[PDB]
Amino acid sequence: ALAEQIVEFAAYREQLSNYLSARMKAIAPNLTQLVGELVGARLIAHSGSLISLAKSPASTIQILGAEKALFRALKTKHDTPKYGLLYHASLVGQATGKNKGKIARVLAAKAAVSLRYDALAEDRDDSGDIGLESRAKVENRLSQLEGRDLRTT
C-alpha cells in the first residue's frame, strides 16, 4: 500500500507538471517561446508577481538566482556571478563559457523585453509571435558567436 501511495504520488506529480506547463503557456506564452516554462515559473516565483518582474530591470533578471554570490562578491570585491537562475535554460545549457555569459546577457535582456510585453499586453493574441521572433534573434546571435572563433587559423 505504501508503494501504491508512491506511484500515485509520481503519476500525480507528472500530471501536475503537465498542468504547470499548460498554466505557464496560458500566463506568459512568449516567455515559453523564449526561455522555458520551468525557468519562467522559477523567475515568477523568485520575483513574486509578474508586474514586479516587469518592473525589474534586465540585470536583476540576469542575477535573480545567485543573489547570495552577487551581494557577497559585491561586498568583498570579487567577480560578480553571471548566470543566477537562467543557467538552467536549454540555450545557456547549449552554450559554453563566455558564450554562456554573453547569451546570458542577451537572453536576460530579450526576456525582459518580451516579458514586459507579456505582462503589460492588455490585449494579447497568445500566439507566441514576440517570443518566437526574439528567440530567433538569440539563435542568430548564438550562431554568430559560435562561428566567431579564438585560435588563429
Binding site: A3, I6, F9, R13, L20, I27
Partner: protein, 203 residues
C-alpha cells in the same frame, strides 16, 4: 406614478400619488422615514435568479441596455394607454421610452428626493420583499462586477502559478523522502535490489 429602482437583491417598483410634487412634499416635510415608506411601501417586485454570472450580466445590461428580466417585470405595468414611470438614468429612460410597451418615463428629474429617501428607508422595505441583509449581497455583486469590468482572463493567475510551482517543489521533496523511507524498509528483503536500482518509481 411608478418608480423603477435597482437593488443588489432585485428590481423594485413603487406606486406614488400623482411624482415631482410628491418628491417636493418629501423633501420639504423630511420624509426619509418609515411613515412615508409605508405610504409608498411596494407596488411590484422581482427577484432575479440565483446565478452569479447571470446577475453579473444583468447588471451589465442595466449599465448599457434593457433586458428580458426587465421585460418579465415590465409585462403588465400599464392599466390604461398612458402610464408614467420615474427613473434616474437618462439613457435607460429613453430606452424604455423606445421599448415596446411605450409607457411614458421621466428621466433624472428632481426625484433624487424619492430615490434617496426610499434608499434611506430601504431597511423598512426589507420586511416587504427581502427578509435578509443586503450587505453581503452587495459585497458579492460588486466583486463580480469588478471582476468582469477588469478583463480577467481566467487562465492567467500569478498567485496560482506560484502556489503550483511551490507545491511541485514540496511534492518532489516528499516523494524523495518517502522514497528513502520505503527503500530502507524494503532493505529488509532486498538490499542488493535497493542498491542496484536508483529510481523511486521503479522501486
Amino acid at each position: 406614478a411608478y418608480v423603477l429602482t435597482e437593488t443588489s437583491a432585485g428590481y423594485a417598483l413603487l406606486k406614488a400619488s400623482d411624482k415631482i410634487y410628491k418628491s417636493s412634499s418629501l423633501i420639504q416635510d423630511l420624509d426619509s422615514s418609515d411613515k412615508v415608506l409605508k405610504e409608498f411601501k411596494i407596488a411590484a417586485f422581482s427577484k432575479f435568479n440565483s446565478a452569479a454570472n447571470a446577475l453579473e450580466e444583468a447588471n451589465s445590461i442595466i449599465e448599457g441596455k434593457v433586458s428580458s428580466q426587465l421585460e418579465k417585470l415590465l409585462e403588465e405595468i400599464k392599466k390604461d394607454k398612458k402610464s408614467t414611470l420615474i427613473v434616474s438614468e437618462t439613457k435607460l429612460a429613453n430606452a424604455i421610452n423606445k421599448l415596446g410597451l411605450n409607457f411614458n418615463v421621466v428621466s433624472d428629474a428632481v426625484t433624487l428626493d424619492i430615490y434617496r429617501a426610499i434608499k434611506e428607508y430601504l431597511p423598512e422595505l426589507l420586511p416587504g420583499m427581502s427578509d435578509n441583509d443586503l450587505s453581503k449581497m452587495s459585497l458579492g455583486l460588486a466583486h463580480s462586477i469588478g471582476r468582469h469590468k477588469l478583463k480577467f482572463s481566467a487562465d492567467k493567475v500569478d498567485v496560482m502559478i506560484i502556489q503550483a510551482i511551490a507545491l511541485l517543489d514540496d511534492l518532489d521533496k516528499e516523494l524523495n523522502t518517502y522514497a528513502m523511507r520505503c527503500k530502507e524498509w524494503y532493505g529488509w528483503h532486498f538490499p542488493e535490489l535497493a542498491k542496484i536500482v536508483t529510481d523511486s518509481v521503479a522501486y
